[PDB]
Amino acid sequence: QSEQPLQVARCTKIINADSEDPKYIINVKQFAKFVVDLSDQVAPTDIEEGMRVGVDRNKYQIHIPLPPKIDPTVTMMQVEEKPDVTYSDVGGCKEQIEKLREVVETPLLHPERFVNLGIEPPKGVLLFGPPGTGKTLCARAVANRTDACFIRVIGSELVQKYVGEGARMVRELFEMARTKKACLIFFDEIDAIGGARFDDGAGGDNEVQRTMLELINQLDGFDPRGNIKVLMATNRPDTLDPALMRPGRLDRKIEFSLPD
Amino acid sequence: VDDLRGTPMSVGTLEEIIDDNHAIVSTSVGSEHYVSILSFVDKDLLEPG
Amino acid sequence: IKESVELPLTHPEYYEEMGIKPPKGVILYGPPGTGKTLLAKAVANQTSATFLRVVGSELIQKYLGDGPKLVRELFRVAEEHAPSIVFIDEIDAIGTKRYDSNSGGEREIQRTMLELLNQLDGFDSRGDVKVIMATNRIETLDPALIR
Amino acid sequence: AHHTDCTFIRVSGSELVQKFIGEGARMVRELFVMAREHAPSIIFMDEIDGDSEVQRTMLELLNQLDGFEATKNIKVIMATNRIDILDSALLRPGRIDRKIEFPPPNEEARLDILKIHSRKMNLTRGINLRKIAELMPGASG
Amino acid sequence: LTKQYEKSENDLKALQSVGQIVGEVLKQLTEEKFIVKATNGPRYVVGCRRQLDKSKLKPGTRVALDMTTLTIMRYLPREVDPLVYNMSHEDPGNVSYSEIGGLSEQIRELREVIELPLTNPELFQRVGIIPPKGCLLYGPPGTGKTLLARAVASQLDCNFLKVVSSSIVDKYIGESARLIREMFNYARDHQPCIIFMDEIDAIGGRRFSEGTSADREIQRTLMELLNQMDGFDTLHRVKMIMATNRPDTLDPALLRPGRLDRKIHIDLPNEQARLDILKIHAGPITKHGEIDYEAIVKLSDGFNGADLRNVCTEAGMFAIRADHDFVVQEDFMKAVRKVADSKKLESKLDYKPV
Amino acid sequence: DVLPPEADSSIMMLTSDQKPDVMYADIGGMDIQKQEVREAVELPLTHFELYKQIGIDPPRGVLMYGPPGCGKTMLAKAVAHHTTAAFIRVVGSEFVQKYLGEGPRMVRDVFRLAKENAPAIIFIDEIDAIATKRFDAQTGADREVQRILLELLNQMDGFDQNVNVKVIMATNRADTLDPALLRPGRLDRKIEFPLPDRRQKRLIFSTITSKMNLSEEVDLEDYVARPDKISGADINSICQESGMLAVRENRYIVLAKDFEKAYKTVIKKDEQEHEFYK
Amino acid sequence: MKDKIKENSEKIKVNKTLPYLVSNVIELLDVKCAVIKTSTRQTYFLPVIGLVDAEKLKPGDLVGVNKDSYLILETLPTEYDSRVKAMEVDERPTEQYSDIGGLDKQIQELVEAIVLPMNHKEKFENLGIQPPKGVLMYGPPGTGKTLLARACAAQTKATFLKLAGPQLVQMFIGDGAKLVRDAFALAKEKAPSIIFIDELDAIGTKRFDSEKAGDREVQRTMLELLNQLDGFQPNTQVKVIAATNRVDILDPALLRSGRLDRKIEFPMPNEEARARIMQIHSRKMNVSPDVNYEELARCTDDFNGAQCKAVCVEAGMIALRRGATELTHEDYMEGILEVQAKKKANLQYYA
Amino acid sequence: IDINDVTPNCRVALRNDSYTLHKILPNKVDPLVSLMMVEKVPDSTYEMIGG
Numbered sequence A: 001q002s003e004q005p006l007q008v009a010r011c012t013k014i015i016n017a018d019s020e021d022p023k024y025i026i027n028v029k030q031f032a033k034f035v036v037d038l039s040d041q042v043a044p045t046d047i048e049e050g051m052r053v054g055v056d057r058n059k060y061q062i063h064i065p066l067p068p069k070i071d072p073t074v075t076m077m078q079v080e081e082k083p084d085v086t087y088s089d090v091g092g093c094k095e096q097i098e099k100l101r102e103v104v105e106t107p108l109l110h111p112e113r114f115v116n117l118g119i120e121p122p123k124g125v126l127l128f129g130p131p132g133t134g135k136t137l138c139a140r141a142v143a144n145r146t147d148a149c150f151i152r153v154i155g156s157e158l159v160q161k162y163v164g165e166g167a168r169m170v171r172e173l174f175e176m177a178r179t180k181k182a183c184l185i186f187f188d189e190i191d192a193i194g195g196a197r198f199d200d201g202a203g204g205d206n207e208v209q210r211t212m213l214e215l216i217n218q219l220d221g222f223d224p225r226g227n228i229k230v231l232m233a234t235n236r237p238d239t240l241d242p243a244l245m246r247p248g249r250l251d252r253k254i255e256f257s258l259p260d
Numbered sequence B: 001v002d003d004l005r006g007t008p009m010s011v012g013t014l015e016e017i018i019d020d021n022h023a024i025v026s027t028s029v030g031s032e033h034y035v036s037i038l039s040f041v042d043k044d045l046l047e048p049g
Numbered sequence C: 001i002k003e004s005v006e007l008p009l010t011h012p013e014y015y016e017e018m019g020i021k022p023p024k025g026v027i028l029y030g031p032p033g034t035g036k037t038l039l040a041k042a043v044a045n046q047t048s049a050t051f052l053r054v055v056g057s058e059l060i061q062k063y064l065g066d067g068p069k070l071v072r073e074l075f076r077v078a079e080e081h082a083p084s085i086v087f088i089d090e091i092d093a094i095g096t097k098r099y100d101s102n103s104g105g106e107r108e109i110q111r112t113m114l115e116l117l118n119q120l121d122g123f124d125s126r127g128d129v130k131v132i133m134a135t136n137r138i139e140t141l142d143p144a145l146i147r
Numbered sequence D: 001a002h003h004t005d006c007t008f009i010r011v012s013g014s015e016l017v018q019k020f021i022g023e024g025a026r027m028v029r030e031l032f033v034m035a036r037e038h039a040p041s042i043i044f045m046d047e048i049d050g051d052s053e054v055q056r057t058m059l060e061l062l063n064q065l066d067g068f069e070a071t072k073n074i075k076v077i078m079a080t081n082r083i084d085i086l087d088s089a090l091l092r093p094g095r096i097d098r099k100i101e102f103p104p105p106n107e108e109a110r111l112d113i114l115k116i117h118s119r120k121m122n123l124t125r126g127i128n129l130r131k132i133a134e135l136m137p138g139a140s141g
Numbered sequence E: 001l002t003k004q005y006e007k008s009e010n011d012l013k014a015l016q017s018v019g020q021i022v023g024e025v026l027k028q029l030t031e032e033k034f035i036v037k038a039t040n041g042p043r044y045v046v047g048c049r050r051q052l053d054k055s056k057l058k059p060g061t062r063v064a065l066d067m068t069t070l071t072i073m074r075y076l077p078r079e080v081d082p083l084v085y086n087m088s089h090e091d092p093g094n095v096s097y098s099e100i101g102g103l104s105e106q107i108r109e110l111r112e113v114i115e116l117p118l119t120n121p122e123l124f125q126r127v128g129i130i131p132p133k134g135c136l137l138y139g140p141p142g143t144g145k146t147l148l149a150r151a152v153a154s155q156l157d158c159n160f161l162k163v164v165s166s167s168i169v170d171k172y173i174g175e176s177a178r179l180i181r182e183m184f185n186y187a188r189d190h191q192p193c194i195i196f197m198d199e200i201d202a203i204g205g206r207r208f209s210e211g212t213s214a215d216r217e218i219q220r221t222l223m224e225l226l227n228q229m230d231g232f233d234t235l236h237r238v239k240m241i242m243a244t245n246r247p248d249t250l251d252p253a254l255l256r257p258g259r260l261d262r263k264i265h266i267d268l269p270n271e272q273a274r275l276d277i278l279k280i281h282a283g284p285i286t287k288h289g290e291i292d293y294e295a296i297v298k299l300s301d302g303f304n305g306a307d308l309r310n311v312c313t314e315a316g317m318f319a320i321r322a323d324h325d326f327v328v329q330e331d332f333m334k335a336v337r338k339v340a341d342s343k344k345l346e347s348k349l350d351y352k353p354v
Numbered sequence F: 001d002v003l004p005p006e007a008d009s010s011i012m013m014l015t016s017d018q019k020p021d022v023m024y025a026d027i028g029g030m031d032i033q034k035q036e037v038r039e040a041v042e043l044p045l046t047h048f049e050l051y052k053q054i055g056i057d058p059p060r061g062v063l064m065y066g067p068p069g070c071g072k073t074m075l076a077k078a079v080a081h082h083t084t085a086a087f088i089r090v091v092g093s094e095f096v097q098k099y100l101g102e103g104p105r106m107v108r109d110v111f112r113l114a115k116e117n118a119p120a121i122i123f124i125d126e127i128d129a130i131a132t133k134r135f136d137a138q139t140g141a142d143r144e145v146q147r148i149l150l151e152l153l154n155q156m157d158g159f160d161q162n163v164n165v166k167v168i169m170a171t172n173r174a175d176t177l178d179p180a181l182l183r184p185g186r187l188d189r190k191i192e193f194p195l196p197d198r199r200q201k202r203l204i205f206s207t208i209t210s211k212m213n214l215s216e217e218v219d220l221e222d223y224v225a226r227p228d229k230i231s232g233a234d235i236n237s238i239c240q241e242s243g244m245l246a247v248r249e250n251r252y253i254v255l256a257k258d259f260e261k262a263y264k265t266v267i268k269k270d271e272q273e274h275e276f277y278k
Numbered sequence G: 001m002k003d004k005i006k007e008n009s010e011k012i013k014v015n016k017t018l019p020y021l022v023s024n025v026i027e028l029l030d031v032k033c034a035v036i037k038t039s040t041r042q043t044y045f046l047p048v049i050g051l052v053d054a055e056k057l058k059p060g061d062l063v064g065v066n067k068d069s070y071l072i073l074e075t076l077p078t079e080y081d082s083r084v085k086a087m088e089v090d091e092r093p094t095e096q097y098s099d100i101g102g103l104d105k106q107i108q109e110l111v112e113a114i115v116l117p118m119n120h121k122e123k124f125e126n127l128g129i130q131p132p133k134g135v136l137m138y139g140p141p142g143t144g145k146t147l148l149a150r151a152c153a154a155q156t157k158a159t160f161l162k163l164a165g166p167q168l169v170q171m172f173i174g175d176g177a178k179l180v181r182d183a184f185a186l187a188k189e190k191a192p193s194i195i196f197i198d199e200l201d202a203i204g205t206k207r208f209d210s211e212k213a214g215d216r217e218v219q220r221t222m223l224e225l226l227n228q229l230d231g232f233q234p235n236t237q238v239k240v241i242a243a244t245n246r247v248d249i250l251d252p253a254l255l256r257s258g259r260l261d262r263k264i265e266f267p268m269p270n271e272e273a274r275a276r277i278m279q280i281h282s283r284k285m286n287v288s289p290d291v292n293y294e295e296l297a298r299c300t301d302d303f304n305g306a307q308c309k310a311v312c313v314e315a316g317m318i319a320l321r322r323g324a325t326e327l328t329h330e331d332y333m334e335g336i337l338e339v340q341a342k343k344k345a346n347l348q349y350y351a
Numbered sequence H: 001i002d003i004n005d006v007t008p009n010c011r012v013a014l015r016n017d018s019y020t021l022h023k024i025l026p027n028k029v030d031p032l033v034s035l036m037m038v039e040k041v042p043d044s045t046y047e048m049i050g051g
Ligand SMILES: Nc1ncnc2c1ncn2[C@@H]1O[C@H](COP(=O)(O)OP(=O)(O)OP(=O)(O)O)[C@@H](O)[C@H]1O
Pocket: A089, A090, A091, A092, A093, A129, A130, A131, A132, A133, A134, A135, A136, A137, A138, A233, A234, A235, C117, C121, C122, C144, C147
């Protein structure tokens, strides 16, 4: 009875935001478009252009700002059950594990040691080596030890049927990764989408190259990446794009060579 | 419980779990709604999609 | 094959007392008609686990990302009905055969193979899912797949 | 299929009919659910003539029918122009239980086909269909 | 103010008015019954106002019906799509043929198909030919196809539909084909009319045999356009100009001479054409000293018109960099050499219709 | 209530004023195609009893296919001009509409209108718009087009031998057509409109040039004998450009130089074949 | 009559109550009358326009109409896509031209083509030359292209529209073209304005001819971009900046001299540039006054600017590793090895 | 209406407001029959096969 249902719309433009009668153009999904006003229980500064809101069904007045829409497939990519592998289960990778931890774990655990000296820790690690050398094992160890949000992305999961969908998933992945104070994204088998750009006359791997370009833009572009520390593992690092293999996107390159 | 559910009971898609008793759900027509999850719902069966 | 798909289920105490997990995967390779699929049928006859059979050529889809999606859903269904045995018969046929319905060429097949790599041994924890693969051309398989 | 009261299913792989086969459409074996509902069934695919999709569908259906299909009386037929183009997997013994050749009709078979098809027409008496059959060397039905 | 009161009362009377649903008359059943289809909605058996003519309600007539009873309130003229209205009411820029250099032959070919048949139809009727209705301006980028179209739209006194092919594509089912149909309906209703579709390879590309659903929709748009250019209904007094720098990818049916009768090649400027374009673009440039346009022409081999405008711009930019109020020949030399250096990054341009 | 069958149709029949002015004589050199169309469309409409008596099953539909500009749509125009039956001209892209269900609704409206006005001819130009062989089930456009194609197949299947309606489909990309449309009872007569042969080229040249004030110095055999593989539209364009060049020089008689220049301009064939290959 | 006027206004206020239905004016007829299409996909005919003067309306105008009578109540601002409105910067990044090392010629070439025409327009009108239209910045990854874009956005008061190629790649047909033309329209309405399109090769891939399949939708988006840059309507009030690593992939119609007049090459930073970059990125870092940045520059052959910054970052890593509070030259030398990412080798048998 | 007569893929009539299943309509076309209608293979017997 008391709690009325609220239809989800998207605010489009605020007219006369300065004055005391600001009108809000909302786009109610597949329903319609309306010019409404905020309810008395919502502050005018709590609604911004382009954000999802929830409005009533009678006068469509904006009742509650809403979180941005995230694809459910992207949402499930975040790890909720940590793996059963610790760093004690990886042998012969002392230096590799130390280098990985001082990038992906130490800055999150003890940031105070870095801000004091004006130090900006690396925000990207590429684990590479022959198959079975322990790249995904070390990633699972990181996910087990980490306390921040850990997201596992397999490159083959970024391949989509339609044009621009993979880039959309990458954008939403980095959008939902930015809704956390600290976050880790694991890109297992990044060579699925991280291949080098080429022009073969036809449209050879154009869409996958666009997905990789979107990932690169999210890693180091005009907008700051945020507190996201990415992590990619591949057994074919020679196929990766030079722009993806560049510091600022993959700052550390940890080699999982065969054990001595 | 039957009276509270009513009839018919529409089939939608759980788009997002905003709160313990609040969620964004999309009906079959593609329109989303910010609705309330009632107590008798098996809240551990709720996942996006 | 019994030491990998039958004994671990009927007599797990052997493996527990020995301190080893059972052999993870099994691939049956040999000339055509030698009895690989017959042995898989015999395993399916005397198994208490859910048996899922998939031909390698069935993993080649008509749309981009649908191959990896099918592999992901196959192993999700395998995880749902645990314990289960996944029989990927004629796995080499995913690569040895080219069909024009496959929008992506060899690259989409490679992406499907990478998804299969993740499913066989990847980041996600695997339940009681046993994988049996059969092929008469094991030289054409990606060596990282059968590692 | 008509004389044995076996349901005749033609599998052309066309997408237009996919909605009838199933909303999934990820595997061709999704058609089996329909075939089991109409057993005895005869699954027919004709190769018009990358690799052949009809022969791939043959391989998948035969693999299912080998020992992994519970319901019986589900037969499967291919039609193909040539037998030397078939995949080695299909030509392996035990997959195709019988291979039947359909050579172009000879003079007598052409005469029989002519008699069958001219029966639907207002024919003057005394047509020398034998002569017309002799006038069509190397003809198909 | 009395006029203020009049306007306020006018607003008050307007407030009691109610909008009427726009539909289309399908068929008059009886003297008081009609079958009408809403623009985007179901078909209804409605009535009609007694005071209405009922003779202007031919099938296909757009009508306005009451919201409640759906009774035919009024008949309206054929609707003009807002996209089509924007196409017609698009400012070219007052471009004259004197702003185009080296294309006198191409200009004459274009005005032979678009200008003379609309002013002197009997000239072509006497010989016994139907004048061409479609021309395709093709060539390397920057040769002046869009400039030629702008000059034609600015100078020729005729109805003009100016559009870019990528701007008619819409995600709704059948919307792009409907836009094409409305474009040609407006052209037919406003004869004589000229339709200029820039960058025709956006929708005029070769029809894929194994494409996606989006490709199929774009091909349906393309071959609705094909049915409009040359289909069952003959197009009269409507001319089509299509511009593209990649005519090799166009559908063979679109390139067919029944639709695109003339194929005007806006080729890269030759020595005299480069000289003409340079004189056109270096005109308003403030200079002292002798300007040897011939040297810039000799070192401008392979340039296009945009290349030569860029040469003038970079000469002025060198003048600015040296803090000068004028441009000398040395600035032009540096500019043309810099543009030639920048030309090394451009791929193949020699593309011709098949 | 039940509405009259001819009512409730968004598609209208061709009126007298909408009849094209193209005659059979206007079309040059398609005697084979003309004969096939007449025997499959215009003859069964007037001689259905003869077809029944002989034992022939008249083809329900006709698929006219060939390279673009080879006289398909013009032959449809000539059929419409020279028919005593109703003609319902439509284009495949017209059926695809925003309102879901309106496509199949107007398909069945077209077929119902043709049935109610038998004898009738249904012409669907550019049939590829609703008769492609590939459908994506997750896109609304492909789902609607699949519905339209299924309704078309059902409408053609629901026409018994008694209903005197003939269907004509025209396309220049028949390789992309769905095979289900070519099954018996839907389109049993696939008529090809190939590129004109040398005799066809001379017939087209004579028919088109008969309407133009030529000079006796012009010999059409000079351009007919050329080995260029050109269509009827190419020949029409050659004659049209000859007239264009005649008009440019303020002339009402086309000379031989005009025809030579027009042929060179229209053909504009890059060699594309290196002599060392033969 | 004043009381009657006020009561009439009160009644209008009652009828003018929110919410409005957002519609687009389709047509204006005379028998003064309007035809509108509501956002509910319904077309209505209004015998009287309503509370908006019919002269102030044109086809396609966005209006707010009565939710019940569908009578036009007010006119609304132009509608731009929420993504396009979200791709406009307002934080105005805090970079500076002094934070870019070894690109003085490139910074000058970009500023005198993007900033100078906006501020010192009189230098062009007096010269009679058209200001340069569009600036492409191409070069190897890490040369400092996006950094220069951030610096340009920093030192400019003009409207800045940050953008990347993949953002214009959309599922539905015409959505990318709509986004491109909406972004250009928004930049026009807020002129003077700069549009920065990063990773131009995402949409700028060269068009090709194929028979079976192809990416015609992204090419349609690119064609819309080409028309916006230099098309039928000459847009000379919006400055366009693009960046790319692989200029060899771009369509030649995009590299034109009317769309991208100046194509600035960003080279590998040379020895002086490498030393300058390391000095720039060591500002907020406690570095001992004995590091030889010249020696570090000599030791970093074939290093891009990103690798030079990573050298300082890894030197800080190593200084933290051994607990030192001040970075020494040895830390920089050993972090050069880390940034080099040389594969592990037992090549101690050499020499 | 008996619940055992409500088989899957059956056509049913639901009330206007409650959507209550109040009638089992005649079953729709079988999906196999629908598929083979579009496939439309020619029916045949042994009598029309020669040689
Ligand atoms: N350094 C190591 N120490 C201990 N066990 C290891 C080590 N490296 C690999 N293993 C074992 O081998 C297995 C190989 O799987 P893992 O996920 O580590 O491979 P990977 O390097 O990711 O291979 P791929 O490149 O094929 O994805 C691990 O699950 C683990 O049991």
